[PDB]
Symmetry: C3
């Protein structure tokens, strides 16, 4: 009779045991990341593999962040940890044939492209804002190129950390060391500073000022000007003088002495009373 | 019959209490697929007893492994005209923090980190890289290299203009030495300090122009200058022992006194 | 009864609802907040999304490591070759008024540390390469507040045990070049040293094995520690001390003084 209709409901309709309720669905969905944002509490691993990932500096990357339509930073990594077991950000490449950079910054804008600040510690310690090391003997550890009209390509300022004028007496703006190989080195013949102009310059090669006043320079011809009393702990070789304030050579002195001697001996030999 | 019905009423799922397939798709489409998607809000990482490691291969709250894939690991791009902060920020707050903000461990055949400042429409005072330290106990920056036949740091200044005098006020390296900005009474800091702690046979300073030696300071501190030079003051030197050595006042005075003595002796003792 | 019609309306059809097994298949394709492996591109396109610049809580991605060990982010590759760099930061508008990267570091080690490992063969590549085409600004700026060190410290280490191997190397190498495309020359300087506020220190101090060899003082006077040469004339002041270099004037005046004195004695002696 109507046992047909009841059997049809028993077959056609879904058991509550064999389907998730809306409450159970919400529990399961709430464990997944929404596209509108969320909090990840474990490791998110990216392992692209035949996934169409591109190198493009606009649309590429396993992660791409495009801030063109938004305020704010693309990415922020923050820690207030007292100590920990590794750095905040690591970039690593293992193959000697790897033919791309770890990091490329392609910057247009009106401020500094990369800005690195080491804040004042409570106790001074030997640590730097930037540490660069290379073990490649075929290349300069670091390269800088600029096109400045009226500034230095590299600008270094040393500021006295203290109000007292003698406090920084052992400091320098630039400090250079030249060392032998650490493990078993027999010495070194490396140079301190090498300056060239491959195409040739009209400028001074070295210009030293103090309170904006010229004190010492080396010109494009290699001649120097020194602004005060100076010393050579040794002999100085120079050209024979042709002007009043030119340094006299031993030859010039000896020739003038011999000329006077000859002239006087002649007068002495020939005078009469 | 009322038993069979009651059983249906209990065992079967209500339409109000279950999502349809259409509603399931709507809800799933709001969640990120492992195969990729577009996130439009903030993704926050807050690991906490989560087994996060420092390993430079498998560590990180985010780990990107590009070993089996072309492309960049990460790209941050903006075409915004202006904005309220930098693209990427790394920040550590504790002065006891004992790791770097960024570590680059590079093997390869090109430059590990490469920073380019493109030509602006109008020149302005901005840099590719700006470094500042307020730590008096350490050098703001350190560089170490092992070059066979190059500089550890190579700086090139290129004239921005075709005209040869345009860059006459520029330099490759510019150094300033200043007093403390707030209330400083002065400074005794040095410009350039060059040493060889282990000792070098090389020239300490070598200056060339068109690849030709013009001026140098040797490993012993002796200098060679390639043209006419000036001291606005006296120069102290050793007494000359060779023809082109500069003569001292003493050498001149001794030679004058020697001649004087010899002549006065002849004058005193001649007879007619 | 038509309680059967009410069951037909109130209850869900099996065809129109996912089973628990089908739900799990679909959920397993989505990222859990507890972690997982993404195998495609994750794109961030915030747009009126409340993204902030804050260096603590901002970013389209924010990683806070305050309550966890480990690194925030690791980018790793063991690829032999590839078609672009691991990480790229790019800004396109010349009006852009923020940095690409800002590091705000407190701590007791190096804020940024860049290492180029020993390659299998030497090649011309660097740990860091900096280039600017902005003529209005220094390509690079460094400021420090060192008590007793250099603001920039450069060390050259001999790559080889043999002492003459690195004879062409330097710690600092400077070149001064004309514009590559059509440049007629340059007047740029090599090294420019100043103290705008004025310093009592030596402007240039050169040592070898920690011993002073050559220096330029704050007044511009120099000291050289060994025999030296000028391929040219040296202009100096007239000497007033025994070891001062004599000028041509000093020599000529002393010669003329002796000459006069002798001619006078010669003119006036009797015997
Ligand atoms: C300092 C100095 O004088 N060094 C000499 C060295 O000159 C340098 O050459 C490099 C180089 O070409 O390898 C120059 O760097 C290039 O700079 C441009 C911007 O001007 C930059 O775009 C290049 O980066 C590439 O850019 C792009 C892109 O789409 O624009 C994509 C790539 O991912 C990226 O790598 C950059 N090239 C590299 C490889 O970094 C630098 O400006 C010069 O100073 C010279 O090559 C050698 C010759 O033997 O001598 C050195 O002394
Ligand atoms: C070509 C030549 O020899 N000119 C003679 C001139 O010498 C030049 O003096 C100028 C000067 O001081 O006016 C020097 O220009 C300075 O160069 C440095 C390094 O490139 C640069 O830092 C100076 O800029 C100042 O510093 C900074 C900064 O960020 O460090 C910013 C400001 O722009 C400024 O405060 C730059 N100064 C200027 C004003 O351009 C140049 O290097 C020297 O060659 C000499 O002084 C006079 C004779 O008294 O004759 C000229 O012919
Ligand atoms: C420029 C100069 O002369 N500085 C002197 C300074 O020497 C520098 O010492 C640092 C150092 O050890 O603190 C050297 O930096 C180390 O370089 C190695 C590569 O040779 C690099 O691997 C280190 O990084 C660590 O590496 C690893 C790893 O697994 O390999 C893990 C860590 O996360 C990472 O930190 C790097 N060390 C640091 C702390 O950055 C640098 O090469 C030297 O030039 C010397 O120590 C002091 C002594 O008073 O004097 C300075 O003048
Ligand atoms: C030890 C000594 O005194 N040698 C005498 C020699 O002086 C040397 O000259 C060489 C030379 O010019 O060949 C100098 O080598 C140059 O050094 C600089 C600094 O390290 C380096 O940049 C040069 O490399 C070239 O430069 C660049 C660059 O990017 O800057 C690109 C070129 O492709 C690259 O090869 C380097 N030149 C070479 C070829 O190695 C060295 O510094 C000087 O000491 C002197 O010229 C002769 C004649 O009197 O006698 C020798 O004994
Ligand atoms: C001598 C020299 O090397 N350059 C001279 C130059 O001095 C430099 O000025 C910059 C600058 O203010 O532009 C100084 O950099 C600032 O450093 C502070 C730390 O002391 C840092 O906080 C600034 O960054 C900002 O910081 C913050 C923040 O919340 O703290 C937020 C911003 O996002 C961030 O940008 C940094 N300012 C910058 C990068 O703009 C630098 O220390 C000085 O050496 C001087 O201005 C000019 C004068 O014409 O001459 C140069 O020669
Ligand atoms: C002010 C003055 O003229 N003093 C004379 C003095 O010369 C000074 O010598 C000191 C010295 O050697 O003690 C010099 O201090 C050195 O300066 C450099 C550059 O800033 C610095 O690197 C040295 O630090 C050593 O170097 C490093 C390093 O990483 O570079 C690591 C070591 O741990 C570190 O200590 C620094 N040396 C010290 C010990 O502070 C200073 O620059 C010179 O001006 C001269 O020696 C004597 C001769 O009798 O007279 C004084 O008046
Ligand atoms: Ni007589």
């Amino acid at each position: 009779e109507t046992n047909s209709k009841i059997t049809k409901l028993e077959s056609s309709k879904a058991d509550k045991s064999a389907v998730y309720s809306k409450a159970e669905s919400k529990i399961e969905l709430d464990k997944k990341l929404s596209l509108t944002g969320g909090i990840v509490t474990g490791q998110l691993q990216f392992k692209p593999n035949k996934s169409g990932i591109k190198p493009s500096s606009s649309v590429g990357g396993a992660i791409n962040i495009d801030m063109s339509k938004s305020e704010g930073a693309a990415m922020v990594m923050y820690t207030n940890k007292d100590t920990t077991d590794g750095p905040l950000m690591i970039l690593r490449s293992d193959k000697d044939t790897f033919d791309q950079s770890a990091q490329f910054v392609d910057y247009s804008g009106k401020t500094n492209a990369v800005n690195i600040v080491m804040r004042q510690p409570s106790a001074p310690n030997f640590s730097s804002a930037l540490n660069i090391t290379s073990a490649n003997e075929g290349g300069s550890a670091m390269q800088i190129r600029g096109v400045e009209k009226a500034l230095g390509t590299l600008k270094i300022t040393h500021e006295n950390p203290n109000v007292e004028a003698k406090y920084d007496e052992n400091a320098a703006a630039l400090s250079i060391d030249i060392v032998k190989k650490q493990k078993g080195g027999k010495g070194t013949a490396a140079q301190g500073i090498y300056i060239n102009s491959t195409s040739g310059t009209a400028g001074k090669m070295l210009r030293i000022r103090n309170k904006n006043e010229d004190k010492f320079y080396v010109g494009p011809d290699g001649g120097f000007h020194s602004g005060a009393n100076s010393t050579v702990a040794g002999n100085l070789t120079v050209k024979d003088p042709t002007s009043g304030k030119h340094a006299a050579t031993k030859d010039y002195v000896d020739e003038k002495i011999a000329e006077l001697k000859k002239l006087i001996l002649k007068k002495l030999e020939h005078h009469h009373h």
